[PDB]
Design an enzyme around this catalytic site. Structure first.
Site, PDB file in Angstrom:
ATOM      1  CG  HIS A   1      -5.427   0.503   6.636  1.00  0.00           C
ATOM      2  ND1 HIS A   1      -5.314  -1.349   6.674  1.00  0.00           N
ATOM      3  CD2 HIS A   1      -4.533   1.027   5.402  1.00  0.00           C
ATOM      4  CE1 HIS A   1      -4.966  -1.342   5.409  1.00  0.00           C
ATOM      5  NE2 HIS A   1      -4.451   0.036   5.039  1.00  0.00           N
TER       6      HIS A   1
ATOM      7  CG  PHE B   1      -1.531  11.525   1.638  1.00  0.00           C
ATOM      8  CD1 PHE B   1      -1.046  11.596   2.825  1.00  0.00           C
ATOM      9  CD2 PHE B   1      -1.832  10.914   1.357  1.00  0.00           C
ATOM     10  CE1 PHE B   1      -0.102  10.098   3.064  1.00  0.00           C
ATOM     11  CE2 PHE B   1      -1.191   9.103   2.061  1.00  0.00           C
ATOM     12  CZ  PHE B   1      -0.894   9.078   3.205  1.00  0.00           C
TER      13      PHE B   1
HETATM   14  N1  LIG Z   1       2.907  11.010   2.186  1.00  0.00           N
HETATM   15  C1  LIG Z   1       2.732  10.699   1.585  1.00  0.00           C
HETATM   16  N2  LIG Z   1       1.415  11.514  -0.163  1.00  0.00           N
HETATM   17  C2  LIG Z   1       0.457  10.280  -0.940  1.00  0.00           C
HETATM   18  N3  LIG Z   1       1.035   8.805  -1.068  1.00  0.00           N
HETATM   19  C3  LIG Z   1       0.930   8.268  -0.001  1.00  0.00           C
HETATM   20  C4  LIG Z   1       1.954   9.268   1.406  1.00  0.00           C
HETATM   21  N4  LIG Z   1       2.664   8.000   1.997  1.00  0.00           N
HETATM   22  C5  LIG Z   1       2.162   6.484   1.550  1.00  0.00           C
HETATM   23  N5  LIG Z   1       1.014   7.367   0.070  1.00  0.00           N
HETATM   24  C6  LIG Z   1       0.896   5.778  -0.563  1.00  0.00           C
HETATM   25  O1  LIG Z   1      -0.162   5.567   0.358  1.00  0.00           O
HETATM   26  C7  LIG Z   1      -0.600   4.441  -0.730  1.00  0.00           C
HETATM   27  C8  LIG Z   1      -1.120   3.465   1.125  1.00  0.00           C
HETATM   28  S1  LIG Z   1      -1.253   1.677  -0.137  1.00  0.00           S
HETATM   29  C9  LIG Z   1      -3.075   1.721  -0.916  1.00  0.00           C
HETATM   30  C10 LIG Z   1      -3.255   1.971  -2.429  1.00  0.00           C
HETATM   31  C11 LIG Z   1      -4.809   2.041  -3.075  1.00  0.00           C
HETATM   32  N6  LIG Z   1      -5.432   3.030  -2.339  1.00  0.00           N
HETATM   33  C12 LIG Z   1      -5.048   0.882  -2.496  1.00  0.00           C
HETATM   34  O2  LIG Z   1      -6.162   0.172  -2.049  1.00  0.00           O
HETATM   35  O3  LIG Z   1      -4.778  -0.691  -3.535  1.00  0.00           O
HETATM   36  C13 LIG Z   1       0.924   3.725  -1.254  1.00  0.00           C
HETATM   37  O4  LIG Z   1       0.532   3.171  -2.274  1.00  0.00           O
HETATM   38  C14 LIG Z   1       1.134   4.786  -0.674  1.00  0.00           C
HETATM   39  O5  LIG Z   1       2.183   5.536  -2.450  1.00  0.00           O
END
Ligand SMILES: Nc1ncnc2c1ncn2[C@@H]1O[C@H](CSCC[C@H](N)C(=O)O)[C@@H](O)[C@H]1O
Ligand SMILES: Nc1ncnc2c1ncn2[C@@H]1O[C@H](CSCC[C@H](N)C(=O)O)[C@@H](O)[C@H]1O
Lengths: 340, 340
Positions: free
Chosen positions: B242, B224
Site C-alpha cells: 500500500h 525488495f
Molecule cells: N526498498 C525497500 N526494501 C525493503 N524494505 C523497505 C523498502 N522500502 C521500505 N521498506 C520498509 O517497508 C516497511 C513498510 S511499513 C510496515 C512495517 C511492518 N510490516 C508492519 O506492518 O508493521 C518499512 O519498515 C520500511 O523500512
C-alpha cells in the site's frame, strides 16, 4: 473498544480534511438528488477521475455518500446537509470551521493554553470580531455558519421554554435572526428585536424582511458593552457569553441587568459544563467548543457555579437551568435581578 | 443521527489537536496509575493550572481521562495506551501521525488528488523513506509507530492462519519484527527472517535479541526492488504494498515470485477494499489510510480485483483471501505462482 476509540480520535484531522475537500469542491451540490458518475463529476471540480474516485470512496467510508455501483455515487442524509441548497444546510458551518481563520489558531493550541489568550490575533493581526468587521466575505460566512449551528436550538427551544407569558423578546447578539424567527413563528402575537453589530444587523434586517416578520421583528445595532436596548419582557443571549473572558461577560450581563429593570428576565442559552468533565452526546463536543473559544477569542464554556458567580456579580441570580434534548448540547439558564 | 455524525466528522481535526497535546506534553505518563491533582501536573509540563485543567477536561470529554473530583484526573483504558511505558503503547503511533511530517502533506490533499503524487516530497524535499533514512529520530519514531499499529494484526494472525505447515517464514519489510515475533512465540520449531532497509534492520536485530529469538530469527537488509531472500516456505508482506504505486508493487511482487520458486507461498497482509466503498468498523478507516498513502508516498489501498491483477502480472495468482477480526481492518491474501 479502548484502542479503536483512541485510533478514531487520532485520525480525526484526516477525516476533517476529507470533509473540507467535499465542501470546497462543492461535490454535494454536484451529486445533488441523483446518482452521479465519477467521470461526469471529474469534469465539474478540476480533479481527474482516479483522484475524485478515491475522495468519494473515503466520503462513502465516512457515511457522506453511497457507491451504489463502482464509480456511481449518491448522497446520504449526512452528505445532503453539505449541499448549499439544503433547507437545513451546514455547508457554510463546514466551510467556516475548516477555513484557515478557524483551524490555523488550533496548530498553536499549547501556546493558547500557556498564555490564556487567543492565537487567532497572532496569526491574523486583530481580535476575531474586529477582523471579521474588516472582512465582509468572512463576516457573511460566519453569519451563515452560526445559522447552521443554531438550527438544533431554534427547532427545540420553544418546545422546552414557555414564551406565552411575554409580549416582547430581544435577542442580544442574535446573529441573522435564526433563533428569534423560530420563536416568532410559533407565537403570532409576540414582538421581537435582534440586537447585533452594524455589520451582522444588515444580514438580520434582510432575513427578517425575507421571512415576512418585518411587521413584528425589528433590528437595532450597537455594542452590548455599551448597552442592551430596554423595554423588553424577555432577553435571550445565545452562544455569546462563551465568546468572552469572565470580566467581559460581567460587562455584558451588567448591560443586560440595566435593560431587565424591574419585570425583565434574561435567558442565557449556552453550554452548562458539569463540575466533573465526562463524555457528552451533544452534536458538538462542549470541551472542544471551550478550546475553540480559547484559541479564537480567549473565551470559554462555563459550569453553572462559574456562571452563577458571574451573574451574582452583574447584580443577577441564576433562577433555574432547563435542559434541551441531548443532541443540542446547550441549556436554558433563567437569570433574574439579584435582591441586593 | 445524520446531523450529529456530520458535526462529529467536521470537529475531527480539533479532537486530534487535543490528543496531540496530551501526547506531546506526556500527560498520560505524568498521571500514570493514580489520581493526579491538576496543580501538581501543571508543574510537570510548563502549562499553568487553568490551561492544563481545560485540556484535561477536554480529554475526559473525549474518553481519555476521568475527573473523579474537580481538578483530580485518572486515565481511562484509552488514555493508558498513550503512556510510553504501556505494554501495548500507541504513544509513538500518536506522536508519528500528529507530527508535521505526516499532517502538513494533508493540508495539500486536493493537490495530491489532482497530481496523483505525494505532497510530502514538496514540503520536506525527498520521498518519505529517503527522508527517514536521513533523519534517524523520525526513522526510530516510524518503527515504534508501525509496532503500535501492527499489535492488532500480530495478536490475531496466528489464530486466523495455520503456520504449522512451514519450516521457515520471511517477513518482507517486516519493520522491527513485531509481526514475526508474535508468530514465532506460538511456533517454537519455526524459523524466521526479517528483510528490511539497513536502517530499520538495526532496530529489528536489537528487538530479536531483546526478545531472545536470535537463535531462530535472523535479520537481513537490502532493497525488495532488487530481490527478496530465497529459501523460505512462506513469505509475509504486511502494510508494505500500500506504500507504492501499481508499477512499484509489481516490481516487489516480481522479487517475491523469484523467491517463491516452486514450493513458496506469499501472504499479502493489507486492507482489501470492497468494489463498492461503505462504512468500515476497522480501528483505522481504510479509505483514510488510502489517502494517507497518496499524500505521504503516492501509494494506495486496493480491492481484491486490483491486487489480483497486480499478482497476475507478477506471474502470481491470488489463491484465497482470509478475514481478520473486524476491528483489525487487514485481510490475509494467499498468493502462489501463476500456471503461466
Ligand atoms: N526498498 C525497500 N526494501 C525493503 N524494505 C523497505 C523498502 N522500502 C521500505 N521498506 C520498509 O517497508 C516497511 C513498510 S511499513 C510496515 C512495517 C511492518 N510490516 C508492519 O506492518 O508493521 C518499512 O519498515 C520500511 O523500512
Ligand atoms: N460588541 C458586540 N455587540 C453586539 N453584538 C456583538 C458584539 N460582539 C459580537 N457580537 C455578536 O455576537 C454574536 C455571537 S455568535 C452567536 C449568534 C447567535 N446568537 C447564534 O447563536 O446563532 C455574533 O453574531 C456577533 O456579531
Amino acid at each position: 473498544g479502548a484502542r479503536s476509540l483512541l485510533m478514531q480520535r487520532l485520525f480525526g484531522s484526516r477525516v476533517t480534511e476529507v470533509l473540507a475537500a467535499m465542501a470546497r469542491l462543492d461535490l454535494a451540490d454536484a451529486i445533488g438528488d441523483g446518482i452521479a458518475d465519477v467521470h461526469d463529476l471529474a469534469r465539474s471540480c478540476d480533479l481527474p477521475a482516479d483522484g475524485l474516485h478515491r475522495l468519494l470512496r473515503a466520503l462513502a467510508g465516512l457515511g457522506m455518500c453511497e457507491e451504489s455501483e463502482p464509480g456511481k455515487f449518491a448522497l446520504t442524509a449526512s452528505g445532503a446537509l453539505l449541499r448549499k441548497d439544503h433547507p437545513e444546510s451546514v455547508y457554510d458551518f463546514a466551510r467556516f470551521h475548516t477555513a484557515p481563520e478557524t483551524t490555523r489558531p488550533w496548530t498553536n493550541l499549547e501556546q493558547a493554553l500557556r498564555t490564556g489568550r487567543p492565537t487567532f490575533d497572532e496569526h491574523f493581526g486583530s481580535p476575531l470580531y474586529e477582523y471579521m468587521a474588516g472582512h465582509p466575505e468572512l463576516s457573511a460566512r460566519f453569519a451563515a455558519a452560526m445559522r447552521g449551528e443554531s438550527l438544533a436550538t431554534a427547532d427545540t427551544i420553544a418546545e422546552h421554554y414557555d414564551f406565552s407569558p411575554y409580549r416582547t423578546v430581544t435577542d442580544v447578539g442574535g446573529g441573522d435572526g435564526t433563533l428569534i424567527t423560530a420563536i416568532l413563528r410559533r407565537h403570532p402575537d409576540l414582538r421581537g428585536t435582534i440586537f447585533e453589530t452594524p455589520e451582522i444587523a444588515e444580514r438580520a434586517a434582510e432575513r427578517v424582511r425575507a421571512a415576512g416578520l418585518h411587521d413584528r421583528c425589528a433590528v437595532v445595532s450597537g455594542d452590548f458593552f455599551d448597552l442592551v436596548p430596554g423595554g423588553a419582557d424577555l432577553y435571550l443571549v445565545k452562544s455569546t457569553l462563551h465568546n468572552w473572558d469572565d470580566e467581559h461577560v460581567v460587562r455584558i450581563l451588567s448591560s443586560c441587568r440595566t435593560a431587565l429593570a424591574d419585570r425583565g428576565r434574561l435567558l442565557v442559552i449556552d453550554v452548562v459544563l458539569p463540575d466533573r468533565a465526562e463524555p457528552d452526546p451533544a452534536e458538538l463536543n462542549p470541551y472542544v467548543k471551550d478550546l475553540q473559544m480559547l484559541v479564537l477569542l480567549g473565551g470559554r464554556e462555563r459550569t453553572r457555579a462559574h456562571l452563577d458567580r458571574l451573574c451574582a456579580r452583574a447584580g443577577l441570580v441564576i433562577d433555574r437551568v432547563l435542559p434541551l434534548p441531548p443532541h443540542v448540547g446547550l441549556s436554558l439558564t433563567e437569570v433574574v435581578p439579584a435582591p441586593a
